[PDB]
Write a protein that binds this ligand. Structure first.
Ligand SMILES: *[C@](O)(Cc1ccc(C(=N)N)cc1)C(=O)O
Ligand SMILES: *[C@](O)(Cc1ccc(C(=N)N)cc1)C(=O)O
Ligand SMILES: *[C@](O)(Cc1ccc(C(=N)N)cc1)C(=O)O
Ligand SMILES: *[C@](O)(Cc1ccc(C(=N)N)cc1)C(=O)O
Lengths: 244, 244, 244, 244
């Protein structure tokens, strides 16, 4: 997370760390607990190539990355059939936990938005994660969970900003309708934050607007971070994730 | 160039090496001389972001990479307008030389293919460049120009191979129509070969079928090399490049 | 610490970690508390070149490296005058803390051996530290304190081993008299443990036999770890460290 | 070679490049031809740990590092028995070529200084090599052979500087008697030059004053380059290398 501060010990009870079997289960992406047995994350964290579930393990919310690990195995990985590359969109995926978790005040789910929310500019949205604090500036130990308040931005205004300084004709759409932009030159999600959540407090309830997807560098001018529009994949998600 | 051998001192007269002003003008992509004044290459080598022409410079064909440079400045860079990402297609771009070249036996142009030629499997095709001799295995000095003979693949079988081991549904074309495939587990282009020419001998003559675009690594099984199908952009090329 | 295990949360009270002011106060060497206001460590961790005290910092014994840092600043650095290189010997130094520490069950001084001791082969000795667990294999997070039990080796046997496979004449001494050897092809200290302690349980008492000084790699055949022999610099240590 | 320029195609006929069989025979040190069948180089380049001659190979003087290689195998390697560390001394070794060379105007031997010769402060001495051009700044291809003119410095003055900014006592001698100093903050030998010649023109003749040995960084303040004193090991050199 570029900019921001260390999230208070009881702030994002839905945050989860996706780990791989390295020399040690090393954090490779984030995700959010949307149902006691399902995790929502970016497909590019686990695709397009098939991953062996043994190599994967989930860590629910924790204030400092490796200090109190309690790795949960995954039972099934579901990546969107249209996903190939983040720039092409559809960068989203579900990880089914082998066993349901026991929700509490410190670990409980995030609410998906209704298929009628647009998350216009002005909304108080936040991105959270344990990713780099700047370009090629990794998060120094003790790996505290950082949060940042980012500003939504009209896809159209965004798409345009992405053409400034580029050879790409304007008739060519860079920012797809299934994506959502947010951030500025000093506030942005970054490498290692992928799969994490962008949640906005709509009418008092934290809703998950998007999933950290891609971008051209961390907090670069005219290059806001791109997130997957949750509302665009609400149905697909529900094919697997029951309502309650 | 995975596989292959060092190329004869008089084999690929159209080969060029694009250089960036580093500590030195180090090579970063190849090209092909298609007109005494224009260089054909992959857009991804010089785009989508705008590049400083002074920071660029073209080196004509040579047997050993930095022994006898004779750098030529580039007058204009013309990246295809629909280009944003290699996977998305349109990975082609043109470079106009400030000054023409005095063609010879060791350095002359390559014949573009006719708009009809499809280069079906069975054609003898070669790829040329100074790139990695395997994944993360950089070409050792004296940096000899290597050539390798690759087998052409039909796009539908190429697309099919690409779906093997991938979560990406089959109704999702991974290998577009403006792309071509060539290569196998022991023969293929690799990092640093991008922008290079895939040429085939069609009826006793060397035509350039494709420009080294992307791939999922180097010489990996079921992930053959993707090249920009030249015939597709034949028109566009000609809009800038005069005939002869 | 190559080989071994994670140490008990109440095992090595004298352990300290030296921190350099970087992006964060990173650990660069171990060190021991031998007096509530004096830290004993290897000269190479802080010399021969003069270091600035504002950049150096001592952290007391902690189970996991960066979790609950409580940095203490250093008042003075006293390297041994005869020091320039580890191989040449005299690899020892003292760090005067700014303020005395409040000794407890978890954090208290280690007993310096009497000038009479030798710690002959067969001594139950242990080395502890937060270093590499193998050559080029850094300590994976959460950085637990490790401990490994190592066999003391007689100098003359150790010097012979150091000649096996080397060009250096036998008459030439590699292992000096102010050095001590301990370890084998499976248990040894490593990069990062430098400056730490090698304590032995002498007649029901923990005595610091040496300081992790140098070696030709971690746990390598015919190259056991070389430690500074403390009895040798006792009088020197005492010119600054009050008795009790 | 920090500072200096590319040496003329006929300036250092005695120059040689030592090569280790890697992915390719990479230059790891320089040396000099002191007799048609022996090469003199710094011991640390080939010791103290025994090396396999099948992996070493000597390339004679060549203007550009890998372009026109002609590797010669070694028959015997003789490391001075007192060697173990450069800071300790006796950094000198001899490689015997399998066959005598055919010396010529471009490739022939250098003259060894007479026992008397001292090389007073200010001497017109030169260092030549294909090493780093600055700390951590490697010599970029085409790897020209570089040279630089460095001023000799008296051992007692040089040793004085090696104490400036260092804890080491003035009573402790850092710059040993079998070493020699040369260079300054903008002209100095560097990483990869080890073993190369330090020749001085003394009364019309180029005499090999020293051998690049060690130093605390390249072109660093109060840390002039330390070379091995040749006059010092003459007798030994001659115990193997015949006179003429
Ligand atoms: C993701 O962290 C990659 C990623 C995501 C988002 C941004 C951004 N600037 N918004 C940069 C990088 C991963 O895959 O590690
Ligand atoms: C290109 O060389 C990248 C590149 C090109 C081709 C392949 C391949 N497997 N055919 C892999 C990578 C560059 O950008 O340097
Ligand atoms: C020390 O840790 C260096 C060091 C010390 C000891 C050994 C060993 N094999 N016993 C290897 C390396 C430092 O300077 O970090
Ligand atoms: C030598 O090149 C190491 C070396 C020698 C001398 C200097 C110097 N500044 N005089 C720097 C480095 C090797 O072992 O590669």
């Amino acid at each position: 997370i570029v900019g921001g501060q260390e999230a208070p010990r009881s702030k994002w009870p839905w945050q989860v760390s996706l780990r791989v079997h390295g020399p040690y289960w090393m954090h490779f992406c984030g995700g959010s607990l949307i149902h006691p047995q399902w995790v929502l994350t970016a497909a590019h964290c686990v695709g397009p190539d098939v991953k062996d579930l043994a190599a994967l393990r989930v860590q629910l919310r924790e204030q400092h990355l490796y200090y109190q690990d309690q790795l949960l195995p995954v039972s099934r990985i579901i990546v969107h059939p249209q996903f190939y590359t983040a720039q092409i969109g559809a960068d989203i995926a579900l990880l089914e936990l082998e066993e349901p978790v026991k929700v509490s005040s410190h670990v409980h789910t995030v609410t998906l938005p209704p298929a009628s929310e647009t998350f216009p500019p002005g909304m108080p949205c936040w991105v959270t994660g344990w990713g780099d604090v700047d370009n090629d500036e990794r998060l120094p130990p003790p790996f505290p969970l950082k949060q940042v308040k980012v500003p939504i931005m009209e896809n159209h205004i965004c798409d345009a900003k992405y053409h400034l300084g580029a050879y790409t004709g304007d008739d060519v759409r860079i920012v797809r309708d299934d994506m959502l932009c947010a951030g500025n030159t000093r506030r942005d999600s970054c490498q290692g934050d992928s799969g994490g959540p962008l949640v906005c407090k709509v009418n008092g309830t934290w809703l998950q607007a998007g999933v950290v997807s891609w971008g051209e560098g961390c907090a670069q001018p005219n290059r806001p971070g791109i997130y997957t529009r949750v509302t665009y994949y609400l149905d697909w998600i529900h094919h697997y994730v029951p309502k309650k």
